[PDB]
Amino acid sequence: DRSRAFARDVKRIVVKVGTAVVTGKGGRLALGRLGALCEQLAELNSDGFEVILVSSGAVGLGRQRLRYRQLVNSSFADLQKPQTELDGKACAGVGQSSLMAYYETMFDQLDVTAAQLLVNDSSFRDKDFRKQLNETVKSMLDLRVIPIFNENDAISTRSSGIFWDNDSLAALLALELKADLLILLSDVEGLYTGPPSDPNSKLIHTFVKEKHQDEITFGMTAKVKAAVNAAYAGIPVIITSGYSAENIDKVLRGLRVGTLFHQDARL
Template structure:
């Protein structure tokens, strides 16, 4: 296989985030598979000895807790999921610690919730923790804090978490290891699918068949495509490969599917607005305002806002919704809802001087 620019960047990356799926290290019958976990740790250690810093994002806490609790399938109710996670997180952290301990490596567990990315102060604290673990030559193993996360504040899957972590630590590459060889043009279980080796930043992936996760996991191909797009916005190339090929994926990278990164990454603030922050409400726009913010990248003025939804305050992130109910952008609103309700549809000249700022400034706005 010819090494593409994206694969070369992944192979040479100094700072790498590696995501490991649940099905790659656990089984319903026996919980954690220590042999497979050791093999993954071997591949990560080899990459670290080659000079890279590696952060591991590990699924598997809920799955690891199933067998010890006598459960035979992944639970659907939140309380049982959290109970399984509380048991599994201990087992998962200990297993990674044991695997890396063979090389004299210390492991630090970092549990994150979506709120840690949505709130700027939490975001900075998580960043400092991961940077300090790296400087102390420890291996950071990140997982979602499943024991406290509710359905409303979950990442949804660890593929998304891994992409956000890649941005958080300023990674040069993201490697997603799972139970599939890569991205296919159709369902590979049908036997006639073709592996897609390279995906350019301009590729249209809307027609690719993307399924849900399996019995043990939550993230299927759809979540991996979403994570690849998210990482591309951060300027991070992505490699999707089978966990059984971990040594190759972390070596020359000539396996799986490589996703090219955008040549110009979003600024940290715009990335946060688009991907990490929770939208606290919505502004309803007329057609002219939609064109201004999504096509001309102009600031949103009160004259183009026809309605508001939700409760928000100045400085919160809100969704910008067009007449067809489609969200066209996200941005940081300058006013509280109560202030904005009295400004709807009014031109700047009609407003008092203290209310003549844009509702959402172009610098704080990201079109979708």
């Protein structure tokens, strides 16, 4: 439109992928969605953008793999007994490795080098750590590498910290790395006036902190809170659906797509 004109000076993008975008039916990987996303990110990176990817959704794939392992090495007599709940940290550790190995496979097939950085909550308490991370990211972006961040859930001792979920980790990274636009890839077209299943609900062209502030009932509430916190500091935030392969290009070209969170746009 006219209020999405900042999509022309955008140089660094922090793209966060949701769990509903990574894991498909049955808990396995969604190969089509992730492949289209990786193709779009490689095209953006070849174009001249500096793309930072904050991956998410390792707990689900990890749990699927660990259930497979239990079955394969389990025995009938046992399958007749009750089941147990698979540890959370074990699932996260198993899923992270598979997800990032798959990311490396497709990025290599796309002729793009991808790098894996893992940052915990206790690490962010040091300003010197922030400076190091900034220097490392700058050096990796100067060679056209896509840093794939995440949260070290497989070692976390864990809300009271700086960040508690990837919805907020993306905002913290975008604020720290001085990004220019933050895209929260979810499974919904954006932010609605009510529940998505409600027919009376309507899409939000842009979020207003004086009108749409208290007009929506909510998960997505954490996404909205992180978006408001990020857009308050001067980082425009776009909530868009990752089910489509051209949404990133549409928002980066200035089209009316997704929900916009901007401090200057809101009046």
